[PDB]
Symmetry: C2
Subunit: 81 residues, 2 copies
């Protein structure tokens, strides 16, 4: 739980430091995500939505988007996955 709290604090501090600098957009990347396509940022910018995330490939059914929360925030496979 300490790890969760630390990550939460770090991300909220990043969000607050990206608001007092007068910036548009903020792109939360992490260590392992290989952003291969050079036009990822431009094609995400050019869609005009608030929160939007590219669908990153993987070797299994895993990816970085859900399609349903059961009751308390747990993954549930909708047929539209």
């Amino acid at each position: 739980d300490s790890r969760y709290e630390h990550v939460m604090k770090l991300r909220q501090a990043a969000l607050k430091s990206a608001r007092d600098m007068w910036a548009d957009y903020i792109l939360f990347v992490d260590a392992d995500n290989l952003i291969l396509n050079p036009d990822t940022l431009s094609l995400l910018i050019a869609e005009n939505k608030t929160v939007v995330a590219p669908m990153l490939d993987s070797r299994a059914a895993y990816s970085n988007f859900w399609c349903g929360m059961t009751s308390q925030g747990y993954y549930k496979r909708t047929p539209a996955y």
Copy 2:
């Protein structure tokens, strides 16, 4: 002549700090000029021009815009003034 090179320094050190803060626009008002209409910023913004200056009234013909520079940067009264 040592006051021109100090007025210029102060402005150029503001246009420099209006760029290193990621800010649109910059309003150069000197604390002598009465800005009466409260909406003047909105009308100036909503015109979509690079350098635009409102016309301010005065007790005489003098205002805050020339209308013709002769050869050496001295005022010339063109008939359109």
